[PDB]
Write a protein that binds this ligand. Structure first.
Ligand SMILES: CCCCCCCC(=O)OC[C@H](COP(=O)(O)O[C@@H]1[C@H](O)[C@H](O)[C@@H](OP(=O)(O)O)[C@H](OP(=O)(O)O)[C@H]1O)OC(=O)CCCCCCC
Ligand SMILES: CCCCCCCC(=O)OC[C@H](COP(=O)(O)O[C@@H]1[C@H](O)[C@H](O)[C@@H](OP(=O)(O)O)[C@H](OP(=O)(O)O)[C@H]1O)OC(=O)CCCCCCC
Ligand SMILES: CCCCCCCCCCCC(=O)OC[C@H](COP(=O)(O)OCC[N+](C)(C)C)OC(=O)CCCCCCCCCCC
Ligand SMILES: CCCCCCCCCCCC(=O)OC[C@H](COP(=O)(O)OCC[N+](C)(C)C)OC(=O)CCCCCCCCCCC
Ligand SMILES: CCCCCCCCCCCC(=O)OC[C@H](COP(=O)(O)OCC[N+](C)(C)C)OC(=O)CCCCCCCCCCC
Ligand SMILES: *[C@@H]1O[C@H](CO)[C@@H](O)[C@H](O)[C@H]1NC(C)=O
Ligand SMILES: *[C@@H]1O[C@H](CO)[C@@H](O)[C@H](O)[C@H]1NC(C)=O
Lengths: 511, 446
């Protein structure tokens, strides 16, 4: 069992290596297939666009201390290292919203207390490295065993819902920035960005997003549909998302006068704010000595960041590596955590962001590599992630190509990923059953062995938990969301059995 | 009453759609008011006097395309369009009088599935083409450019490009189509109670129209073309026509040559009406006579597009009530004026795509791409070689293409006649290519 406490220290790490690394040649060789190239192309945008957006947001929140270039270099390097040495190479490491919230909060704290923000991050990274060495030594990751389908699916459904809602929020922001008006001030300055309302930008962006989503879904149906020869049908379907990107990008390109926001990458491989910092951060201090009390007091934020990264990455790995996804090469819970957090700490030493495996993107990477016969198999390899990381790193040199990619096309892609991520989740299935008559419920054990109203009460409790988590996320106490998620684990083990019989829980909540 | 509401809305939506289409195409000589009043009066007459109350008289795509072709022909010939229509109606009343003396039972049998499927596919294709051509027209009239003249006058019609009209029109049309298709899927879905689900699905077109109309309404600044409805019961364009079109011309005396030659367009109108009724005797005579009388007042011809004693009386009164409500619809001018044209064209495209489902020619066209493994278990798959079935489909596609060119070139009025020319092909020329068994499987009564 991958989750078992062995007497020997660092047992999880060594068994993880001994279980996965023998498959290295197979991992290298299994990437020789068109589906792998299509997944590479899809995940490249799926990971670069969030990277660019979060880098820009980080640059705005901080005094340009950490910006787009830093995040892009961190993502490229960490992705390459994880793909080459990761136990589960299908995971894709990247920045996340909670990490952005933590870095703005730590920035505010450091500014209030007068410390150096980047040096504080360096010390947080040192603390993270120490904590993870300690945890992996004692095989702490085994606690992830207690995370059942209940918590896994609540987390995954919530994350997908936030993804979709945020994409729609970006569309709404595009509309607000350029409201539909009778008259628009022409010859508006656009040097920093459009400084005022513009004509046809909002509606054209909406059309591009809708078209991209429609074409992606239609090509997916074509992949699952019966028309055309099987080989050509599947080849076209695997490249469905890339084909949609190409079609909508060309459609935008041929429109020569309307303005659609384009994906912009940093000018070159340089620190975003050269005056503020260099490439390497001196732990003692860039301009002033770092207080000793902070050297010792970074343990609390370091533990908070460790909890954030641990819960997200481990729950993402659990979701990705479920038995129903037909993963044979196995998965790693100790080596992956060690790699992710240690690389994050080393990056902090270099003034670069720390990343975590991200759920919508990891699930999308796994799905793009899934071969449907039911799921016949999954093309597990280390080349797709490595190529995605290399492309993310080289994006700075791919400015001419990337300047022609609208942001609305990527919004449509994000909607596609958010919609398709909801498919293999029992919580979503039961939510859908909330509207179907009991006559139409499928043939699943939790339907026959559990009365309709009892399972609907289960789904209602899960929906209440989802609402509570969303309220917490909206509240300025957002960084406490993971801990609230931990409160779900007792709920299944303590409170729910007081209301639900053992057989009903076993049928509804099963591995 | 639920039934009289269903039919009332299902008649209003095509009525307003076709009225807008014709008012756009015919320069508002034939508009929404004409279609609404014609449908009301003719439905009253059909219910009170018709043999089959179930058959409902309403404007149809074949008649719309014929009227477009006749309008174009009148424009080229410099003849007044409505007067030519009333003379066509005169020839039609003479023809319907003739039909009484001479039985036409065999004519019903002569038309086969070949012609019916070709015709239905052609009208669906015409619908789709029109919804895309109107989209292209809107985009051309209001291009996408960096700067627009902001003092443009919109009194007769927007005299220059407008900022967001084109993309908003595309959005409204696509949204109407998507909503209609999604509600159609919902009708057969497993969600919600069966009765509520079926009720919502039946009102798919009205619900989509309402949603997109509200979407347009809440957008104030942007301008989208709106269906034009006279405030009262009056005619479409006062400058154009009166309630009683005078034979021998309104502005210029009607040519005598067209007086004599109206028979051929009347013959093609009768061909279209006959064939449209066939795919769905005394009822046809009543419809043709009512259309001929209507042509005098400038109202359009309407075909029975769609198809113990106490139940018959109930059907009669229900048809009468729906006709009366359709007639009174014009008194709802505000709401109709709020309705855009993008929504109506979206519903047009929805109908065009939906009509293709039943047609077997569409099924064969789809099968052309499908590998022979996935071909269905239908008799014309098992008992006919894929090569022969594909040859049948190809010949039908050639017939459709020839009909399309006939539509495109100036000799568009011949479109019905050429369609009838498929009957010889099926009866005479095809049996040479195909054996009796293969022909019977590929096309059949059922
Ligand atoms: C290189 C490009 C290849 C496409 C060229 C097109 C090649 C072509 O025209 O013949 C293929 C196909 C018939 O395929 P065909 O009878 O040979 O059946 C194929 C073959 O028998 C396989 O064994 C089938 O698997 P299975 O053992 O039965 O389970 C496989 O189906 P699938 O189970 O694998 O799905 C089939 O591919 O014909 C079409 O209708 C496609 C219209 C395409 C016309 C569209 C043109 C625009
Ligand atoms: C606004 C509704 C919001 C959705 C609420 C959730 C909608 C929802 O869950 O529906 C199922 C539920 C139970 O329905 P129920 O078990 O009684 O079964 C339904 C119906 O009563 C018949 O029993 C079924 O047909 P049949 O004669 O037996 O063959 C029919 O199936 P079909 O006709 O489809 O084949 C079913 O529609 O309906 C409600 O009563 C509550 C909603 C009432 C409101
Ligand atoms: C995949 C398809 C998704 C469909 C949903 C589209 C979301 C639109 C967001 C509206 C933005 C907003 O709220 O508009 C804010 C601003 C006003 O600016 P303000 O006064 O500052 O607020 O309005 C505008 O100028 C735009 C007017 C509303 C446009 C509505 C378009 C609806 C299209 C629907 C086709 C299905
Ligand atoms: C295909 C893979 C993606 C592309 C990656 C390209 C990286 C380019 C780096 C800049 C050029 C250079 O080497 O930096 C030159 C400076 C000059 O020194 P100074 O700053 O003036 O002092 O050297 C340094 O201080 C150390 C530079 C460290 C760069 C580390 C970046 C990657 C690891 C990030 C943490 C995980
Ligand atoms: C499946 C697709 C459904 C939607 C199809 C929409 C077709 C519209 C074609 C108009 C062509 C035209 O004729 O436009 C001509 C005008 C004339 O402008 P100009 O003189 O060249 O100056 C500049 O240019 C335009 O207004 C802009 C033309 C590009 C609009 C592209 C919209 C694409 C939407 C794609 C949604 C998937
Ligand atoms: C870099 O940071 C410094 C901090 O003092 C500040 O001038 C500003 O935030 C940045 N300067 C730039 C981007 O020129
Ligand atoms: C109204 O009808 C007259 C009749 O000749 C025509 O000239 C005019 O263009 C029409 N106007 C509109 C807006 O349809």
């Amino acid at each position: 069992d991958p989750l078992q406490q062995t007497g020997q220290l660092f047992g999880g790490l060594v068994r993880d290596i001994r279980r996965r690394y023998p498959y290295y040649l197979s991992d290298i060789t299994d990437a020789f297939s068109p589906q792998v190239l299509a997944a590479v192309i899809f995940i490249y945008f799926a990971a670069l666009s969030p990277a660019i957006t979060f880098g820009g947001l980080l640059g705005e929140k901080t005094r340009n201390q950490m910006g787009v270039s830093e995040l892009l270099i961190s993502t490229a390097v960490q992705g390459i290292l994880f793909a080459l040495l990761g136990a589960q190479p299908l995971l894709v490491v990247g920045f996340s919203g909670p990490l952005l919230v933590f870095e703005e909060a730590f920035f505010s704290f450091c500014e209030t207390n007068g410390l150096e923000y980047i040096v504080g991050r360096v010390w947080i990274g040192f603390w993270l490295i120490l904590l993870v060495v300690l945890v992996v030594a004692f095989e702490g990751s085994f606690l992830v065993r207690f995370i059942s389908r209940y918590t896994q699916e609540i987390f995954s459904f919530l994350i997908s819902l936030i993804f979709i809602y945020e994409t729609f929020s970006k569309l709404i922001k595009i509309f607000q920035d350029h409201p539909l008006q009778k008259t628009y001030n022409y010859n508006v300055l656009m040097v920093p960005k459009p400084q005022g309302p513009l004509p046809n930008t909002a509606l054209l962006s909406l059309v591009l997003m809708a078209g991209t989503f429609f074409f992606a879904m239609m090509l997916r149906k074509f992949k699952n549909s019966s028309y055309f020869p099987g080989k050509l049908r599947r080849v076209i379907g695997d490249f469905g998302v890339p084909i949609s990107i190409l079609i909508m990008v060309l459609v935008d390109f041929f429109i020569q006068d309307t303005y659609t926001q384009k994906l912009s990458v940093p000018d070159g491989f340089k620190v975003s704010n050269s005056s503020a910092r260099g490439w390497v951060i001196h732990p003692l201090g860039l301009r002033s000595e770092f207080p000793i009390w902070m050297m010792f007091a970074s343990a609390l934020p370091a533990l908070l960041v460790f909890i954030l990264i641990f819960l997200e990455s481990q729950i993402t790995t659990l979701i990705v590596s479920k038995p129903e996804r037909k993963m044979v090469k196995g998965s790693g819970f100790h080596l992956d955590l060690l790699l992710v957090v240690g690389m994050g700490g080393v990056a902090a030493l270099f003034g670069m962001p720390w990343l975590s495996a991200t759920t919508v993107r990891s699930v999308t990477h796994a799905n793009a590599l899934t071969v449907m016969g039911q799921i016949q198999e999954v093309k597990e390899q280390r080349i797709s992630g490595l190529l995605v990381a290399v492309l993310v790193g080289l994006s700075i040199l791919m400015e001419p190509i990337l300047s022609r990619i609208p942001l609305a096309v990527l919004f449509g892609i994000f909607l596609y990923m958010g919609v398709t991520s909801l498919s293999g989740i029992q919580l979503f299935d039961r939510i859908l059953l909330l509207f179907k008559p009991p006559k139409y419920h499928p043939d699943v054990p939790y339907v026959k062995r559990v009365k309709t109203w009892r399972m609907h009460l289960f789904t209602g409790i899960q929906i209440i938990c989802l609402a509570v988590l969303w309220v917490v996320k909206s509240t300025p106490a957002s960084l406490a969301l993971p801990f609230v998620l931990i409160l779900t684990v007792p709920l299944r083990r303590v409170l729910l059995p007081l209301i639900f019989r053992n057989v009903e829980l076993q049928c509804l909540d099963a591995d």
